Amino acid sequence: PEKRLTVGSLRR
Amino acid sequence: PEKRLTVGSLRR
Amino acid sequence: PEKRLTVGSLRR
Amino acid sequence: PDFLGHAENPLREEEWARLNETVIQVARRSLVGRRILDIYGPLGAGVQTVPYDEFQGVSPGAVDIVGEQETAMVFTDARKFKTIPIIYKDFLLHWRDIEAARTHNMPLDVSAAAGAAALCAQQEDELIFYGDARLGYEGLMTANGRLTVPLGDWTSPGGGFQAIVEATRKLNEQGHFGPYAVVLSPRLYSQLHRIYEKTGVLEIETIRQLASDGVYQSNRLRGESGVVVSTGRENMDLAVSMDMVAAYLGASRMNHPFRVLEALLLRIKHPDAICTL
Amino acid sequence: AENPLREEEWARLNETVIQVARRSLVGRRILDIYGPLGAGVQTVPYDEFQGVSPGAVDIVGEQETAMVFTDARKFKTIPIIYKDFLLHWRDIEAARTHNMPLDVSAAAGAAALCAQQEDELIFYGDARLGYEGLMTANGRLTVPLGDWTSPGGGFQAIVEATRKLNEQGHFGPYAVVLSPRLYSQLHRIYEKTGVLEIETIRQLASDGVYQSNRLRGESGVVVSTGRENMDLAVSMDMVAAYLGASRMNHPFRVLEALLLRIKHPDAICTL
Amino acid sequence: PDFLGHAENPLREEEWARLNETVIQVARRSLVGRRILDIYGPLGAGVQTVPYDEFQGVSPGAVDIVGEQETAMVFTDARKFKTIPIIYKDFLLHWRDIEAARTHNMPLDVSAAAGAAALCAQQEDELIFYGDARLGYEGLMTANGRLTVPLGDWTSPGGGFQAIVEATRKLNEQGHFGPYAVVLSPRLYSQLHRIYEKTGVLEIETIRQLASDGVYQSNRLRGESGVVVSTGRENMDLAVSMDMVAAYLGASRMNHPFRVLEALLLRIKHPDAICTL
């Protein structure tokens, strides 16, 4: 149900 | 709580 | 699940 | 009660029902455009953009015993995603009639709602028939790719329908022929019915033979213009986020204002089944 | 006709694309992203800007200064950015039975190409389709970044850019992105005592000074790192997808769906 | 939930079995090359390269009282591996036929399979008897070191035997003696296959007596050519990575295409056991 995110956790 | 179109159904 | 040659080895 | 102020909903169930029935009735009576246009279904209120889809296209499509001929399916020329505007009008009630209608005059008086719905539908038709250029919308008598044709021969018997014959010829040449529809301005719709000497038959009869989906008249159109279209889908559509509904705008001065709403967009999927002057 | 690779090979492929992306990207390091909107969304709202309203009434009671809203409502369509590659079935069989690396070089190449493409998009929008370039956005606050090859060089330009931003009432922790030539030619070791020029610039900036080759020869930009000035709406991150077998060879495609919406076009300065 | 779609295998187990049996039988009928060589066994699909043995040798093991010969057989540079190609054809099977085979007429006909299998076998035989330059491969009538010896002497009632006698002498002069085999072009073979040689019976019997491992027919070979080889392994080989079999490509427009495969390579470990025109 949640729309996952993989690469883009880079801060700011 | 459907979409339930009300006025506009005039044929053709 | 083996190699299982099918049409080979003609007269030889 | 009526002093507490800013109660969320003033009216009770039956008053809402009467408002809705009234606005539906007046809309259905006073709408001309929605009668030659299949509407794209009720999307919702959240949606605010629709896929304005096509611009052109023609491909024969062939027949064979086995089925290998390589006809490329009609996909699209350019995706656009136009937005959906909103059309609205608003009116007032006197906070006492909502009391008389609860004791004395049991059905509530709603003439203002009908007066508002008339103007709202008027603007609807004006939008379908014309652009604005303040949001970049295209109207039937404005959109590029209209296949203009001169039509000056009227005020005399020797003519009139020849123009619409020419319009049929031009539309057919584009390989786009089907059940036509015709809309005309009052200054000429009245002109059609003249009973000049050696009368024979009045012209709108032949025109309605040649149209087969109804010849209509709309005042929103200018004095001396009129259009001919091909009724089907894949040429015109009408994206409808939400039909005419009544909503409440807070209570000011103890009175009660309301507003009739609807969100439409005209999307022409084939600016080739159109003709004008 | 089926899904060729198993869980382990899927995992290896996905981690390869993930690692190459996370290494190669500079855009994700300076902007913050609107939440992953899911695949279905294809358009998003836009921005709000040049609402020059002092709003500083500050009375007992209240006056009727105007409210802030989007200058002109409109939308934009999220593009799709993709690369494609191929695999040969005999190689999958070998990796299955004889030798067991499963070479995934092609995935790495595709991921690099996709990431390069999207960074070029962020720093320079597509002209034909019609989007915004960080070196071509309108209302861009130009400032000469020239006269380098001096002991006191880029500092005198960054300070000028910062005063230009700050006179616009638009400040905060700043960020800088510089072309390779300028960024590497910046190690003019000495300012006066012992400090490298890059690190004193960084002390002035406080949100990193990065290098991206995608920029032109002699250019760079400085921005105000906050949100509510810039954004990065995503519909899905870079991932791998299968395109169905074709002539027994398996194709594949790596996907990413992005769009930046510069809400406040005042935090931009250039050469 | 019905037939239409891009579904998986249309066929069924009995139908698959019949298809496989048909391709096997046409292969066995059609393959002439695989009857003089002998195969290095099934190595599996995954393999794609195989060692390539180098070149000639005249080192005969000697017998002595006390072992001191040491029988050296030293190779020169490397092993020079080579790659295993693929060969294939097509199976356009109409979808309506498969539908009829479920509810109506039910002889599912697979003659296109037999045609494709014949074409595949003919092509790979052409590969064995002739390499392809684009892949840099080698063939029996083109290798370097064929010991060519002209014939130019047939169409006379008996002038065919001495050619093969001389060919056997040339084979043996390189110290390479054994049970020979001969492959011949159609009209040459029929011309040989003529009346008694005036010294007994048909020439084919003397030739089969001399060759002692068959005298075979090849339309795949050129007009007036033919070859004789020494059947034994340790000289010639046929590495197979997988035998001929059929696989289902995908869904075409709506039909169902297949493909028949095998992955072979002949290894000529000693280009001295070949004699030609």
Side-chain angles (χ1 to χ4, degrees), chain A residues 1-11, chain B, chain C, chain D residues 1-3 5-7 9-103 105-197 199-233 235-277, chain E residues 1-33 35-97 99-271, chain F residues 1-5 7-65 67-103 105-176 178-277:
Chain A
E2 280 74 39
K3 314 302 161 103
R4 303 289 61 181
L5 187 147
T6 62
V7 167
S9 74
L10 279 61
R11 64 171 180 310
Chain B
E2 312 286 90
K3 285 323 171 63
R4 274 191 41 260
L5 191 154
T6 62
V7 64
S9 284
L10 294 175
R11 174 280 331 281
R12 73 191 38 175
Chain C
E2 289 86 5
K3 291 302 154 298
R4 284 290 310 94
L5 189 76
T6 58
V7 65
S9 295
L10 294 174
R11 218 233 359 128
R12 284 201 55 70
Chain D
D2 60 357
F3 319 102
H6 284 265
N9 49 340
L11 323 173
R12 202 178 291 114
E13 282 300 321
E14 301 77 70
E15 284 97 16
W16 280 120
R18 275 205 94 247
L19 287 173
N20 292 331
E21 268 160 35
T22 300
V23 60
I24 289 187
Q25 270 194 27
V26 187
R28 276 194 203 141
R29 212 170 328 290
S30 189
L31 270 177
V32 298
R34 209 180 292 225
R35 265 211 286 275
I36 52 167
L37 279 158
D38 288 304
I39 73 165
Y40 187 71
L43 302 177
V47 178
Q48 310 173 228
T49 46
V50 288
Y52 198 88
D53 218 342
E54 293 182 355
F55 278 146
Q56 189 274 331
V58 59
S59 88
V63 60
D64 208 5
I65 298 98
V66 179
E68 289 101 10
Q69 286 295 110
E70 289 282 328
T71 59
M73 183 177 177
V74 286
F75 169 44
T76 295
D77 193 82
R79 269 295 170 84
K80 302 310 300 323
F81 280 98
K82 283 220 163 65
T83 189
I84 281 177
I86 200 157
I87 304 104
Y88 63 92
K89 184 70 174 191
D90 60 357
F91 58 92
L92 198 55
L93 308 187
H94 196 278
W95 89 262
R96 291 219 272 183
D97 306 353
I98 310 171
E99 275 290 335
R102 280 196 178 90
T103 77
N105 316 330
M106 297 301 260
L108 158 67
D109 178 25
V110 286
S111 280
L119 277 297
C120 170
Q122 193 72 258
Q123 284 304 111
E124 185 153 320
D125 291 331
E126 199 278 333
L127 168 66
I128 297 169
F129 279 51
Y130 269 94
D132 53 4
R134 291 189 58 250
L135 286 88
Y137 293 146
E138 293 179 353
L140 271 294
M141 283 73 74
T142 62
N144 63 7
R146 265 170 314 105
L147 297 93
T148 69
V149 54
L151 56 88
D153 59 354
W154 306 48
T155 49
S156 174
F161 64 93
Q162 59 86 16
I164 192 166
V165 173
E166 202 81 12
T168 61
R169 184 261 161 180
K170 306 298 289 319
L171 289 176
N172 184 30
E173 195 199 26
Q174 307 325 97
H176 209 185
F177 63 94
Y180 302 162
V182 188
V183 177
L184 183 62
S185 81
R187 265 298 308 276
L188 294 168
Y189 194 104
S190 78
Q191 170 68 302
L192 271 182
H193 299 283
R194 189 180 289 130
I195 313 299
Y196 62 84
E197 202 49 45
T199 76
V201 54
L202 61 83
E203 275 200 357
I204 76 155
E205 274 308 331
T206 64
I207 301 305
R208 204 141 51 260
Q209 311 292 307
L210 263 181
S212 73
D213 212 8
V215 185
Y216 292 76
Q217 176 186 179
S218 169
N219 45 357
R220 291 279 74 188
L221 200 150
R222 303 309 200 275
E224 292 292 336
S225 297
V227 290
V228 189
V229 300
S230 88
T231 187
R233 296 192 214 177
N235 304 323
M236 283 76 74
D237 202 340
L238 200 62
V240 177
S241 287
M242 182 179 72
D243 283 329
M244 292 180 183
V245 176
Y248 184 28
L249 272 64
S252 77
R253 269 193 287 270
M254 293 182 286
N255 278 346
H256 282 344
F258 291 75
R259 156 182 283 186
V260 292
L261 294 174
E262 51 76 20
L264 299 190
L265 172 59
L266 160 78
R267 51 177 189 167
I268 62 170
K269 285 184 263 230
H270 212 294
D272 270 320
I274 315 288
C275 195
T276 66
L277 184 143
Chain E
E2 288 85 3
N3 303 53
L5 301 89
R6 292 180 179 91
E7 289 82 358
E8 293 82 3
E9 309 166 272
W10 263 126
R12 287 186 88 269
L13 197 85
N14 281 344
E15 301 206 280
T16 297
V17 306
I18 282 173
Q19 290 318 312
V20 181
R22 294 178 66 188
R23 176 180 90 199
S24 189
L25 284 165
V26 62
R28 311 288 181 98
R29 249 198 290 273
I30 196 176
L31 316 176
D32 204 318
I33 59 187
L37 306 165
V41 182
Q42 316 178 28
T43 58
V44 291
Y46 208 27
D47 59 348
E48 65 91 4
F49 63 91
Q50 274 81 18
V52 192
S53 170
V57 287
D58 186 75
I59 313 285
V60 293
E62 186 75 32
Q63 298 175 207
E64 286 179 357
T65 191
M67 191 43 178
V68 296
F69 193 55
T70 285
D71 183 16
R73 187 82 154 175
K74 39 163 85 164
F75 281 61
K76 298 282 275 296
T77 68
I78 283 171
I80 190 166
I81 300 299
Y82 59 98
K83 191 50 189 205
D84 54 355
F85 66 96
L86 189 44
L87 289 181
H88 189 295
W89 57 288
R90 294 178 67 188
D91 294 356
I92 294 90
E93 268 300 315
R96 212 154 285 207
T97 62
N99 57 6
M100 280 87 89
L102 189 49
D103 177 28
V104 290
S105 177
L113 270 297
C114 182
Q116 274 298 336
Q117 202 56 255
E118 76 89 19
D119 265 335
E120 163 71 8
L121 158 74
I122 279 183
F123 283 88
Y124 289 88
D126 196 312
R128 190 259 309 165
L129 198 153
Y131 290 166
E132 290 288 0
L134 267 289
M135 310 216 177
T136 59
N138 217 24
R140 212 165 68 246
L141 277 169
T142 182
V143 56
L145 292 174
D147 295 332
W148 289 39
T149 66
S150 181
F155 203 79
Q156 296 316 108
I158 285 278
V159 60
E160 182 65 26
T162 61
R163 72 186 285 272
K164 286 296 293 294
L165 268 77
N166 199 359
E167 298 192 62
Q168 293 299 130
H170 197 191
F171 42 68
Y174 304 170
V176 178
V177 166
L178 278 160
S179 83
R181 169 55 152 145
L182 299 179
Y183 174 82
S184 193
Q185 192 260 327
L186 205 57
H187 271 76
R188 286 189 322 284
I189 302 157
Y190 54 96
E191 195 55 31
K192 179 54 70 181
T193 67
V195 163
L196 300 176
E197 190 148 22
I198 297 89
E199 190 277 331
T200 186
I201 287 286
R202 189 173 304 163
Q203 181 251 1
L204 188 149
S206 79
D207 207 351
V209 172
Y210 303 85
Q211 160 178 245
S212 177
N213 53 282
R214 195 41 72 182
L215 283 71
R216 297 302 152 89
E218 293 274 328
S219 310
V221 300
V222 58
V223 300
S224 306
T225 188
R227 204 186 303 174
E228 72 265 0
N229 315 267
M230 304 160 314
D231 217 338
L232 200 81
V234 301
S235 191
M236 64 183 73
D237 293 85
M238 185 180 288
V239 73
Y242 181 75
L243 265 52
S246 169
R247 303 204 274 225
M248 271 178 320
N249 286 331
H250 310 161
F252 279 92
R253 155 169 294 183
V254 285
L255 285 156
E256 186 178 3
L258 289 169
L259 178 76
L260 73 165
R261 33 166 166 167
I262 43 171
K263 297 194 187 94
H264 212 279
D266 267 329
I268 308 314
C269 283
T270 46
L271 176 141
Chain F
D2 43 353
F3 64 96
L4 59 83
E8 290 61 50
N9 63 327
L11 278 296
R12 286 159 293 190
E13 270 170 270
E14 293 82 3
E15 283 154 300
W16 265 120
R18 286 178 51 234
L19 203 64
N20 288 341
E21 199 206 338
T22 302
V23 295
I24 282 176
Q25 305 287 352
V26 185
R28 287 201 188 140
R29 275 193 55 167
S30 45
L31 283 186
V32 64
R34 209 183 293 192
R35 256 208 302 274
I36 63 170
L37 274 71
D38 54 356
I39 69 163
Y40 174 26
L43 315 175
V47 187
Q48 317 181 44
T49 57
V50 66
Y52 206 80
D53 219 352
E54 290 293 320
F55 83 105
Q56 86 261 7
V58 296
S59 72
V63 287
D64 289 333
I65 296 172
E68 291 287 295
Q69 59 264 18
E70 298 286 332
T71 174
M73 186 66 204
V74 304
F75 63 91
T76 80
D77 53 51
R79 282 163 78 107
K80 324 203 311 293
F81 288 57
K82 286 180 85 64
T83 71
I84 298 160
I86 306 185
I87 311 89
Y88 46 90
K89 283 300 291 185
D90 69 348
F91 274 38
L92 192 49
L93 267 70
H94 204 274
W95 57 283
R96 274 201 281 192
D97 294 351
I98 298 197
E99 178 79 12
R102 307 289 184 99
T103 61
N105 190 36
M106 316 175 180
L108 181 50
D109 203 8
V110 289
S111 78
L119 268 298
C120 173
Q122 187 170 4
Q123 185 70 315
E124 63 86 20
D125 263 7
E126 208 280 335
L127 159 70
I128 290 176
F129 287 91
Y130 284 100
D132 199 352
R134 198 189 42 120
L135 270 294
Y137 279 48
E138 267 307 331
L140 259 58
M141 271 76 57
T142 188
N144 284 104
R146 286 165 299 148
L147 298 167
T148 178
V149 62
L151 72 165
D153 219 353
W154 296 41
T155 72
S156 286
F161 187 46
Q162 56 265 26
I164 293 181
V165 176
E166 183 178 1
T168 54
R169 181 164 70 84
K170 196 73 65 69
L171 264 291
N172 212 2
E173 185 171 6
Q174 313 317 285
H176 205 186
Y180 301 153
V182 191
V183 163
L184 273 189
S185 68
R187 283 301 81 101
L188 206 69
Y189 175 102
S190 79
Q191 173 178 147
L192 171 74
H193 194 192
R194 208 177 39 243
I195 70 171
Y196 50 98
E197 201 262 328
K198 304 272 301 313
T199 301
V201 303
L202 322 179
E203 308 200 358
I204 190 167
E205 287 292 325
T206 62
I207 304 287
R208 299 184 80 125
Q209 202 86 350
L210 176 48
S212 57
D213 196 73
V215 171
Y216 300 97
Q217 182 63 257
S218 177
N219 64 7
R220 204 67 274 190
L221 188 153
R222 250 75 157 179
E224 190 148 23
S225 302
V227 287
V228 53
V229 310
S230 309
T231 175
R233 200 171 32 205
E234 325 201 333
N235 296 115
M236 293 180 183
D237 189 359
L238 205 67
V240 309
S241 181
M242 65 180 288
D243 268 331
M244 185 179 288
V245 73
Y248 167 85
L249 286 193
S252 171
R253 282 86 170 185
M254 321 187 48
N255 314 307
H256 308 284
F258 303 70
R259 160 181 278 189
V260 286
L261 300 167
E262 70 184 9
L264 315 193
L265 179 61
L266 73 165
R267 297 184 293 175
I268 54 171
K269 326 198 194 172
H270 185 78
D272 278 332
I274 298 169
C275 194
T276 67
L277 176 146

